[PDB]
Motif scaffolding. Structure first.
Motif, PDB file in Angstrom:
ATOM      1  N   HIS A 127       1.103   5.593   1.355  1.00 51.53           N
ATOM      2  CA  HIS A 127       0.653   6.780   2.091  1.00 51.53           C
ATOM      3  C   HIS A 127       1.017   7.987   1.242  1.00 51.53           C
ATOM      4  O   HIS A 127       2.101   7.983   0.632  1.00 51.53           O
ATOM      5  N   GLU A 175       5.743   8.995   5.336  1.00 48.97           N
ATOM      6  CA  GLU A 175       5.704   8.737   6.789  1.00 48.97           C
ATOM      7  C   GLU A 175       7.113   8.906   7.366  1.00 48.97           C
ATOM      8  O   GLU A 175       7.355   9.785   8.197  1.00 48.97           O
ATOM      9  N   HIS A 233       0.862  -1.187   0.000  1.00 46.18           N
ATOM     10  CA  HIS A 233       0.000   0.000   0.000  1.00 46.18           C
ATOM     11  C   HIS A 233       0.888   1.223   0.000  1.00 46.18           C
ATOM     12  O   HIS A 233       2.107   1.112   0.145  1.00 46.18           O
ATOM     13  N   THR A 237       2.450   1.637  11.359  1.00 46.99           N
ATOM     14  CA  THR A 237       2.204   3.085  11.393  1.00 46.99           C
ATOM     15  C   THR A 237       0.720   3.424  11.461  1.00 46.99           C
ATOM     16  O   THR A 237       0.382   4.625  11.485  1.00 46.99           O
ATOM     17  N   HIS A 250       4.805   0.895   1.008  1.00 47.28           N
ATOM     18  CA  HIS A 250       5.088  -0.103   2.046  1.00 47.28           C
ATOM     19  C   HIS A 250       4.777  -1.495   1.501  1.00 47.28           C
ATOM     20  O   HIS A 250       3.595  -1.804   1.236  1.00 47.28           O
TER      21      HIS A 250
END
Ligand SMILES: Cc1cn([C@H]2C[C@H](n3cc(COc4ccc(S(N)(=O)=O)cc4)nn3)[C@@H](CO)O2)c(=O)[nH]c1=O
Ligand SMILES: [Zn+2]
Length: 258
Positions: free
Chosen positions: A94, A104, A92, A196, A117
């Motif tokens: 972010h 992140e 996935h 996270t 990730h």
């Protein structure tokens, strides 16, 4: 009143339901490149994705996950800081509302436009759910995204996002090759950390690649058309789904490279 990335349910609130949010090995962190120590005992990463079997893509209300068959050693991460074999279960991203934020991890306080990730679990624990209960249960390979040239290997992902706009939608997503998301170099930083997102479990060996991949402005714009909400709910764009850097506490970040 579920966790998320809004004003009323974002990262500064998570500790109320997930007290480990204030724990000793939380992620992400800022990577201070001058303080990270070269560790000549660290091995090259082994990324073995030739037999990967992607199955599905899911909008889970927080990000979208490209899921893999993890019922055999088909797509595995080994070497580097790791002992044993870690199987790819999903990847996935972010990302931000703006090209100037979204990652992140940060590098000398620099924020990238997004962060990939690739999530792997330690086969000695038998399944993902058992692995997240162990301090060496997961290995997450993190890759920064900057906006510039398109990433050709990302486009198949971008083009299916219209079919999973809202929370709870999934689509078939077979024969996707995650090798097309890697940069040229596997030089990395590594440290012990956490998930996270809630439940923020302290089960991750983080491996963050030094070399970002480039994606186009049009590719990241399509990420930003996704929705946090379900169909039939008020539309809230899925942007700024990143947790900020957490205190390093009693940890050392190691570099695989000079
Ligand atoms: C595809 C699949 C899923 N599941 C289970 C386990 C799944 N799950 C995920 C999580 C949270 O995991 C995280 C959180 C943050 C990160 S981060 N951002 O990299 O730090 C990484 C991982 N907790 N449980 C759950 C929902 O997908 O369904 C399964 O059993 N088999 C499967 O084939
Ligand atoms: Zn993540």
């Amino acid at each position: 009143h579920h966790w998320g990335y809004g004003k009323h349910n974002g990262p500064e609130h998570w500790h109320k339901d997930f007290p480990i949010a204030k724990g000793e090995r939380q992620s992400p962190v800022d990577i201070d490149t001058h303080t990270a120590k070269y560790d000549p005992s660290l091995k090259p990463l082994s990324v073995s994705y030739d037999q990967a079997t992607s199955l599905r893509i899911l909008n889970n209300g927080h990000a979208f996950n490209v899921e893999f068959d993890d019922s055999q050693d088909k797509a595995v991460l080994k070497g580097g800081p790791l002992d044993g074999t870690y199987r790819l279960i999903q990847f996935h991203f972010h990302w931000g509302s703006l090209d100037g934020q979204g990652s992140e991890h940060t590098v000398d306080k620099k924020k990238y436009a997004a962060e990939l990730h690739l999530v792997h679990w330690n086969t000695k624990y038998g399944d993902f759910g058992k692995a997240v209960q162990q301090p060496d249960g997961l290995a997450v390979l993190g890759i920064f995204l900057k906006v510039g040239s398109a990433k050709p290997g990302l486009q198949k992902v971008v083009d299916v996002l219209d079919s999973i706009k809202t929370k709870g939608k999934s689509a078939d997503f077979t024969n996707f090759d995650p090798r097309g998301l890697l940069p040229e170099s596997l030089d990395y930083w590594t440290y012990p950390g956490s998930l996270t997102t809630p439940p923020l479990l302290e089960c991750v060996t983080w491996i963050v690649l030094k070399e970002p991949i480039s994606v186009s402005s049009e590719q990241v714009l399509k990420f930003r058309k996704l929705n946090f909400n379900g169909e039939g709910e008020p539309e809230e764009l899925m942007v700024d789904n990143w947790r900020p850097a957490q205190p390093l506490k009693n940890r050392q970040i190691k570099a695989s490279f000079k």
